A paper describes a structure:
We herein elucidated the crystal structures of AcnXType-I from Agrobacterium tumefaciens (AtAcnX) and AcnXType-II from Thermococcus kodakarensis (TkAcnX) without a ligand and in complex with substrates. AtAcnX and TkAcnX contained the [2Fe-2S] and [3Fe-4S] clusters, respectively, conforming to UV and EPR spectroscopy analyses.
Therefore, to elucidate the catalytic mechanism at the atomic level, we performed a crystallographic analysis of AcnXType-IIb from TkAcnX; the small and large subunits (TkAcnXS and TkAcnXL) showed sequence identities of 43% and 37% with those of ApAcnX, respectively. The crystal structure of TkAcnX in the apo-form was elucidated at 3.4 Å by molecular replacement using the coordinate set for the structure of AtAcnX in the apo-form; recombinant ApAcnX was also originally prepared, but not crystallized. Fe1, Fe3, and Fe4 atoms were ligated to the protein by Cys110(L), Cys342(L), and Cys283(L), respectively (the letters in parentheses indicate the location in the subunit). On the other hand, among the [Fe-S] cluster-binding sites, only Cys110(L) (yellow-green) and Cys342(L) (green) were homologous to Cys273 and Cys508 in AtAcnX, respectively, whereas Cys283(L) (aqua) corresponded to Cys358 in mAcn.
Numbering used by the authors:
A (entry chain A), C (entry chain C): 1 to 386
B (entry chain B): 0 to 130
D (entry chain D): 2 to 130
Write the structure that this text describes.
């Protein structure tokens, strides 16, 4: 991968052990994917935030790097944090501080496209978490690889990524055509479809015919689910995605998703309500209309919940639902909007044994971890709950 | 003598005794960063150490944070002396870089079996088999 | 204009005086622009929120509609409010409250695309604020006309709009090319450029060549200005706009913007610091990195401002500035972040007499209100500030 | 008889008052009095209340539709509106105030003071001589 004369200084440690190692990683990646040059990124999202993930090893590198003098050279935000006992939490906040000391915006969310950092169509960025990468690539038309934890951190310190993969016009072209004959209209239906399409596809860039989502949030989900079961960082919805007209550039095979395909997944997450002691909505982090949805749903329920309801959401969304009286409503019934945190990445196996959710991503991960799960729309979940 | 050619990922030279696995090793929760003992649900190798051994395995897998496990491994001195991967992905190469662990990819790992003494010139991507 | 059998019943009056009179409005605008049918909208944005602009005749109408049971059938937010003495605020809160009773998100920002309401590419919506319209059409690819106060509300009530203008493909094609030969690098540059292009162009859909904006906020401002000195509801930037590839479909003329064009605008907004008693940034409402910029700038200044600085912002952005520590750095140096209000729309005439700003829209409206104004970038406004 | 378009129905007869200038309701008309306030309108001081208004087009602020509604509550509203071309400000005002409006009529054939009848349901103006 071609390196500028300045980049080949940084590589030679002229600007410090922190920039050197950052650059050292970025050339190792360019040498693996045959990127031509390093392109500048306009923002970055760094992965490896929860203490359950990176652990003490993660803090070790993060610590030495901050001491070496690592500082981000572009506007970068963070990935969601964990929730746990205060012994755990004390360690987590140490992680978030190290990232802060590097100059990162500590906004700890996977929906930074709500208030925090909204990329423009065609912006090259270094984002790191699947649901966000799929959203920025597919529903915003910006460009970013599915960067890892360390790859995004290095990209955020140099200010550049290798110019491989989804940064190139030819790589954003459609791979498969997905014809959705099944009835897919509720939020949970896009959860269950994204599950199935990710699990049956490979490293494809699908092209969705016959898909007309009511709420943009359904696609936010759809991509997230596909990013869990599969490895989809980009799709197209004919008429809804900004890049859909140029997506196809050769003959493609058409796979079809029938109602039988989806029922087989809806029915895999139907554990009894008596094994469910928690509700998670907000995977990915709820929008304001998602929260307003849950608020008005409890107003018509009249009575509170006997199990806790959790709405994971960006700091920006919470602070809206606060000022609009939505979180006041949600808290009077037994609910709480948990800001800038994530549950699937938190050590909660000993706190709750069963999650009900409208997310297909959480349904997928929690089932594998060993929890009872129950997958349904929020309107159904809030009605049936104890 | 029988020099095996590969690509430079991380320079440096290291001689020593081999351990080989024909299975994608995962590094987040796959290696105990204190002991270097391989702890992975699926693995050629469970309950064997990596410290001071040449680690030959097809590719890294799992979560991208595994690079940090390697960084912790190295600062605990329980890291391999060198790493002969078949195919360099971004988990193990990143960990090699931040750890300064000599790494080489592109080697035909079928010509390496566990126990074979070997030197790795990672500066040149070469693998002599000392006998 | 064709009406579905349900729509003629709304006009027939089956669903109340509210939906009827709202439908009566719509079928009169359709019969003016020749809409074929009514198309549904995914969200709305109601203009006519400041008591300065709608006055008592405003609260007149909104009182009697709240009485007859008018509710909005689609998610909808508000134009910004005003700022004044406590009389004005009581009436202002009345206006906001009346809209709230119609089921409106009382967000009151011109940047709902941060946190509040982010339209997807190709979504038909019914927005009214000019700066927000320019964003939805040009930078997001969503489709809406420049609605009015009463029409944005009428559409928000029924959930549909006349299908004309910017909802139709062919009216989104460019009508003129803008060869930006001038140096346009900074926020003020895109401010002063938009003032020009907006003033020289008619009801054009301009296509920008040679325009590589570093920050999307530059295009937020570039659109806000053209919408203030002209009627530019949608523009294309080459390589940066989601619809720019299919923009030019027939022979277009090319106007060029020389440096002398931009210089003339700068020097009509060069009033002495001795004529200024207020600094306004955030017009349109600042993004998060805009607030970040101002804070890091007051950092280097290290002394407080002796005339007061105001950052008008969405409450979404204001909230992040709170939680990230940017506000505390601002209020320590005499700044203040004003959520969901607007200054060109507040009766400030007696309170201040001179506005220093970086916005071309604010400069144009404040100059034409009679105030002395001084237009520069934020870094200069804060260095040389008293 | 002059033929135009049915913007808002109803029937009304009254005294014609004419403007040959685009009239802007937000600012140029007082909701309390019906008097024109515009600085340079033909009828700088004339009141619209209970008359037959004739003017080529409305203009100004989208909010002007609300002024026309206040005129109708405060009872100083015109009996009918004859515009050259019906636009969003004036039409919305008549729609929400139930004021009869008919556009597309030769407004030049109407001079101030004429006794005139407007059948807005069928969109026709008849001059009474
Ligand atoms: S990071 Fe966000 S996307 Fe879902 S799995 Fe966690 S809530
Ligand atoms: S309404 Fe908003 S866009 Fe600017 S001129 Fe006022 S702050």
């Amino acid at each position: 991968m071609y390196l500028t004369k300045e980049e080949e200084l940084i590589l030679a440690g002229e600007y410090g052990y922190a920039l050197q190692k950052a650059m050292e990683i970025l050339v190792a990646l360019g040498d693996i994917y045959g990127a031509d040059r390093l392109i500048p990124i306009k923002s970055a999202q760094v992965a490896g935030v929860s203490y359950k993930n990176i652990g003490d090893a993660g803090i070790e590198f993060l610590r030495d790097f901050v001491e070496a003098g690592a500082k981000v050279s572009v506007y970068t935000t963070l990935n969601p944090a964990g929730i746990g006992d205060d012994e755990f939490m004390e360690k987590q906040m140490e992680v978030l501080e190290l990232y802060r000391k590097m100059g990162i915006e500590v906004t700890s969310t996977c929906t930074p496209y709500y208030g925090a950092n909204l990329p423009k169509f065609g912006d090259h960025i270094a984002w790191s978490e699947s649901s966000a990468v799929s959203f920025a690539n597919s529903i915003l038309g910006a460009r970013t690889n599915r960067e890892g934890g360390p790859s995004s951190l290095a990209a955020a310190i140099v200010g550049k990524t290798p110019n491989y993969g989804l940064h190139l016009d030819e790589n954003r072209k459609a791979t498969v055509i997905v014809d959705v004959k099944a009835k897919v209209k509720t939020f949970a239906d896009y959860s269950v479809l994204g599950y199935h399409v990710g699990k049956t596809l490979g490293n494809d860039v699908p092209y969705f015919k016959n898909l007309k989502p009511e709420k943009t949030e359904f696609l936010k989900e759809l991509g997230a689910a596909m990013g869990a079961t599969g490895s989809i960082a980009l799709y197209h919805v004919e008429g809804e995605t900004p890049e859909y007209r140029e997506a196809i550039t050769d003959k493609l095979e058409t796979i079809t998703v029938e109602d039988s395909d989806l029922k087989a997944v809806r029915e895999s997450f139907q554990d009894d309500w008596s094994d469910i002691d928690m509700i998670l909505i907000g995977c990915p982090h709820a929008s304001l209309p998602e929260v307003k949805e849950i608020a008005e749903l409890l107003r018509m329920r009249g009575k509170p919940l006997k199990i806790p309801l959790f709405i994971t959401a960006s700091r920006a969304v919470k602070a809206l639902a606060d000022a609009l009286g939505y979180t006041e409503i949600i808290e009077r019934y037994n609910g709480k909007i948990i800001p800038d945190s994530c549950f699937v990445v938190s050590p909660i196996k000993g706190w709750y044994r069963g999650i009900a959710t409208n997310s297909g991503k959480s349904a997928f991960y929690f089932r594998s971890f060993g929890f009872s799960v129950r997958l349904d729309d929020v309107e159904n979940l809030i009605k049936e709950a104890p | 003598g029988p020099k095996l050619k590969g690509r430079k990922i991380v320079g440096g030279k290291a001689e020593g005794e081999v351990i080989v696995s024909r299975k994608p090793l995962s590094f987040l929760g796959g290696v105990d960063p204190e002991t270097g003992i391989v702890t992975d649900a699926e693995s050629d190798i469970r309950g064997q150490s990596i410290a001071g051994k040449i680690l030959v395995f097809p590719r890294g897998k799992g979560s991208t944070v595994g690079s940090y496990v390697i960084y912790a491994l190295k600062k605990n001195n329980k890291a391999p002396k060198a790493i002969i991967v078949g195919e360099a992905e971004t988990i193990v190469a990143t960990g090699a870089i931040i750890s300064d662990i000599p790494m080489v990819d592109g080697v035909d790992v079928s010509k390496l079996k566990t126990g074979m003494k070997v030197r790795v010139d990672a500066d040149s991507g070469e693998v002599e088999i000392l006998e």
